[PDB]
Amino acid sequence: PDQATIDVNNRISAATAKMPDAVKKLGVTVRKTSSTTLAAISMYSSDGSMSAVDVYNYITLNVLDELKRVPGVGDANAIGNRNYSLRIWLKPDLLNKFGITATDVISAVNDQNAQYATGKIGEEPVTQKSPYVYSITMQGRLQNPSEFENIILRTNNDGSFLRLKDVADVEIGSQQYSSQGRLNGNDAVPIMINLQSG
Amino acid sequence: TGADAQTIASTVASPIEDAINGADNMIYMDSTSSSSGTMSLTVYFDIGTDPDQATIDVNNRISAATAKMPDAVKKLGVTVRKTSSTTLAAISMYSSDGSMSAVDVYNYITLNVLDELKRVPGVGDANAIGNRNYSLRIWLKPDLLNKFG
Amino acid sequence: ENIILRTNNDGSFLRLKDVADVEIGSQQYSSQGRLNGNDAVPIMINLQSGANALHTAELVQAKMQELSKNFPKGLTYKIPYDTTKFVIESIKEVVKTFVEALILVIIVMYMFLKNFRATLIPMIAVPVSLLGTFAGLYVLGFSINLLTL
Amino acid sequence: SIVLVLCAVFVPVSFISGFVGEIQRQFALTLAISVTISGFVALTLTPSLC
Amino acid sequence: MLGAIFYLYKAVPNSLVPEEDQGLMISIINLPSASALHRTISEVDHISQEVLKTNGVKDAMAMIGFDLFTSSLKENAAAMFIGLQDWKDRNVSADQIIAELNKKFAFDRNASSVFIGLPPIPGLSITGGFEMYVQNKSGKSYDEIQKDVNKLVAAANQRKELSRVRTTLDTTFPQYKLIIDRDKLKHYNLNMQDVFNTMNATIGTYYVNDFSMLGKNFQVNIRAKGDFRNTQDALKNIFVRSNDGKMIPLDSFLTLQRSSGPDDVKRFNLFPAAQVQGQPAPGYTSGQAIEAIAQVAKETLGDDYSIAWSGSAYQEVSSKGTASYAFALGMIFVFLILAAQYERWLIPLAVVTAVPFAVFGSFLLVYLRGFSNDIYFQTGLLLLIGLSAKNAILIV
Amino acid sequence: MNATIGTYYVNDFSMLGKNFQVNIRAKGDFRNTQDALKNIFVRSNDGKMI
C-alpha cells in the first residue's frame, strides 16, 4: 500500500504543472485510505432537551474529536459538515436602509479580524539596558462572537457607531440545512466511524 | 508568528497530533508550542523501525490535517522531516589577538565556514548559535523619523 | 541606504539612510558564546539520522583544517566537545581487552596441556570459529559493534 | 551436548525484539555461531591434527 | 542456597545499561524567569570559572541565552558543554565531577544550575538521567498544572534516591499586552494593517523581502533603534498616519497592561503536560530513582493526572521482567535437548540443577561489589545456563 | 454574489480552544431569484449603487 501511495505521490508533481491556477492555490492532496465503515454511531435526545442542532453542536465540540483520538480510527465523521463556522447572516433589508453593501461587510470583517504582533522590552537596540526582559503582544484577532457584532461598519459623525449587529445577525456553527439523520423514526445525528487504512 | 504558546498548542499542535496519532509503530510524541510563534512536534517510533518509512508515513497524515490549520499557518507552510537528537561535535572559533571582536568572527563563520561544514556528509545541522544566516537590518531611528514626518 | 524616501521640491531626495541605519547582518546581543572565559562563536555539528558518526567526525576535523588556511589574523579554532573521541577510545580498550584475554587463555591452556603442540592444536579453534562467525553476521544482516566485540 | 546446550539457550532468545532484544541478540548470535563452529573444529580438525 | 538466591535477588537494584564516563558532561543553567541576557552572561561566567578550576575538567564551552532542550533562544537560560581531561590523566570519574559540582551549586540562588552526564546510548536522550511527563486529563490550566507539579518536584528532591529534579514548565514569565481601543481606532481613522505593521517595524521585526549578494541570499528586516526608557515612552514617539493625513501616536488608542503566562507550553501523548527531569542520587541506580519518582507521584498528584516516561526510562519500564521469559526458555530447551540426546528424562534433571549455583555466584559477586541487575548482567546469566551445564554434562 | 446567495469565506478566529471559519451569507426571504436580484446592490466605482 505504501509503495503505491508513493508511486502515486511521485507522479502528482509532474501534473500539478498543467493544473488551472485556482487548483494550485488550494493544493492537490493524496493519501492511502480505505473504502470502509467500521461502525455508525447515532446520537439523539431522549426527551426534548437538546434540539436537532443542539445535539450536532455538542457532538462537534466534544464528541467528534474525542473519537478522532481512539487509535485505528480513520475518521469520525458526523454527517453534515466539512469545517465549522461563525456565520454572519446579512439582513439585506436593513442593509439597504443604512447604506451598506455586501462588499462593505466583507471588507469590514476582513480588516477588523486581523492577526497578532509580538515584540520585546529590553531588546538591546530598542531599550535601556535593564534587569528583566518582557515580551509585548497585540492581539488584533477576535475571540468571542460579541466582538464580531461590534465590528464598526461606518463611523457616524455624532460619535456613535453603526456596528455589524445593526445590519446582520451573527450565529455560531450548526445551520442544519445540509443533512438530517433519523434513528427509528426519531431525530438523531449520525456519526460514521471509519477504520484507519491498515 | 504572533500567537502565544497557549493558542498555538491548542489550534496548531493538537490538530497535527490527532492526525499523526495512530501512526505505525509510534511509541509517543512530545509537543512544545512557543511564544515565539513556533510549534515543534516530535513523533517517536518503536526501537528498530524504518526511519524513512515513518517520515513518509507522517508526511501523509500531515496533508490531511493541513486543512484544519488556521489560515495563517498554511500561508507559510508546515514542514516535516526525519532528524535525530545526537549532537556529535561543537567547534569554537575565536580571535586570539582580540582583533576580530565577537561579531566580526560570527560574520566570518556565516559566509565561509558554516556552508563548508554543512557540506561534509553525515552532518544534519551545522549551526552557529543565534541568527539563521544573517539579514540586512534597517534600524529605524524614530527621532529623525518624526523629524521628517 | 540610497532607497529614496521622499521626493523634494529642490529636486533633492530624502533617502533611507537619513532616517535609518542599514547594517548588514551580524546580529548578536541575543546569544553570547564563551570558551574558557573568552568570546567565541560555537558551531554545533549535529548528526543526521542514520550515519556512521565515527567516520563523519573525521571529515569535519579535516575540512576545518582546510579552512584554517584561509583564517586571517589570530582566528583559530578548537573542537572542545568531541563525542567521537570516546568511541575511538572505548574501541581501543575493547581491542586491548581482547588481546589481553587471548593471552590469558593461551597461558591457562599451555599450563594444562603442558607442551606446545598440545596447545597450538586447540588454538586453531580461535581463528576458525571467531573468524568464521563474521561470515554468518554478514549473511544474516548484522554489524560489527561494541556489543559484538 | 556443549554446543547444543548453548544453542538451546541463545537461538530462542535471538527471536525476541525490543531494546533488550536487539542488545541481547548481538550476544546470542555471535556466541551460537562461534561455539557451533568450535564444535565442528573439535569434531574434525582437532583430532585429525593430533 | 536456593532461597539465598531469592533474597539476593531483592537486594540487587535494577538498571538498563551503564552510563559511561564519556569524557564529557553538560550543565543546564536557568536564571529567574524575568532575567535579561546580560544577567545570564554574568551568572554563567561565575559558574564557568568555578567549573574550570575543578579537577577533572579540561575546557568549558558555553551557549549563553540558549535552551539546550527546546533548542531555541531564551535569555534566562544557558547550556555549558564541559570536556574532561583524557582518561589516563584524571584521578576522578565524571560521575564524581558531576556530583561534586552539583553539591556546590545546590544553593546558588542567582540561578539554577544542574550538572549532568551524556546519555547511555547516543540518541536515547539529550542528557543523561531520566525524563518523564506529568499529563493532566482534568482540562486544567497550565497555571494550575504548574502548582500541582511544583508540589511533586518539591517532594521529589527530598527523596534520598533522587537528585536535581526539576520541571521546564515556567508560567511566571512577565508578559505585557497591548489592548486596542477599536472605537478610538476608527475615530482617529486608521488602517489597521498600517497599525500592526508599524508595531512590528519598531518593537518587533518586520520582514519585507530578500535580495542577493556575495552569492548568498539575505533577508531584509526593519527594526527600531530608538532609545525608549519605559514602554509608555515608546508608544508616544511611534506614529501612524490616518487615512486623512493625520499622524496618530500609538499611546492614544493602545492601552498597555501586564499579565503573566507561559512562554513554552508542552503536550505529551495528546494531553497538556509538564516535563519533569532529574537524575539519581549518587550511588543509586536508574531503576532505583524511577521507583522513587513514581512513588512520590502517587502521593503528590490527583486522579486527574498520570505520568508518561521517555527515553532511557521508557525502555527500562517497558522492559521490566523480560528477564524471566528469556531465562525460562533456555532452561526448557536445554532440558529438552538433553532429554532427547541421552534418552532419559532424569539425566537432564541432574544437569539442570547446576544452574542455581551459577546464578548464586553471579548475584553474590554483583551484590558484594555494589553492581546492579542490568541488561549486561542478565545476558551473562543466560550464558551461565549454557556454561554451567557444560560442567554438569561432563560429569552426568 | 457569494456573500448573499452562496457563502463567502472571509477569514478565521480561535475560540473555545478550537479554530473556526467566518462566513457571510444573506438571510433574505427569496420570493424567487429574479426579485432577489433587486434587493442586492453593489456600488459602482463612481458611488452609484446598482
Residue numbers in the entry:
A (entry chain C): 101 to 298
B (entry chain A): 51 to 199
C (entry chain A): 249 to 397
D (entry chain A): 447 to 496
E (entry chain A): 546 to 941
F (entry chain C): 744 to 793
Paper excerpt:
The Cme locus consists of three tandemly linked genes (cmeABC) encoding protein components of the tripartite Cme efflux pump (CmeA, CmeB, and CmeC), where all three components are absolutely required for substrate expulsion. This tripartite system is composed of the CmeB efflux pump, an inner membrane resistance-nodulation-cell division (RND)12 transport protein that contains substrate-binding sites and transduces the electrochemical energy required for pumping drugs out of the cell; the CmeA periplasmic protein, a member of the membrane fusion protein family; and the CmeC outer membrane-associated protein that is integral to the outer membrane. To understand the transport mechanism of the CmeB efflux pump from C. jejuni, we here define the X-ray structures of this membrane protein, which assembles as a trimer. Overall, CmeB adopts the fold of a typical hydrophobe-amphiphile efflux (HAE)-RND-type protein and forms a homotrimer, with its pseudo threefold symmetrical axis positioning perpendicular to the membrane surface. Each subunit of CmeB contains 12 transmembrane helices (TM1-TM12) and a large periplasmic domain created by two extracellular loops between TM1 and TM2, and between TM7 and TM8, respectively.
Two distinct conformations of CmeB with space groups C2 (form I) and P1 (form II) were captured in two different forms of crystals. In the form I structure, the three periplasmic clefts of the CmeB trimer are closed. Although the conformations of the three monomers are different from each other, they are more similar to the “extrusion” form of AcrB. A channel for extrusion is found in each protomer of our form I structure. We therefore assigned the conformational state of these three protomers as the “extrusion” form. All of the extrusion protomers in both form I and form II crystals share very similar structural features, which include the conformation of transmembrane helices and position of side chains of residues within the proton-relay network such as D409 and D410 of TM4 and K935 of TM10. For the asymmetric CmeB trimer, the conformations of the three protomers display in such a way that either only one out of the three periplasmic clefts is open or all of these clefts are closed.
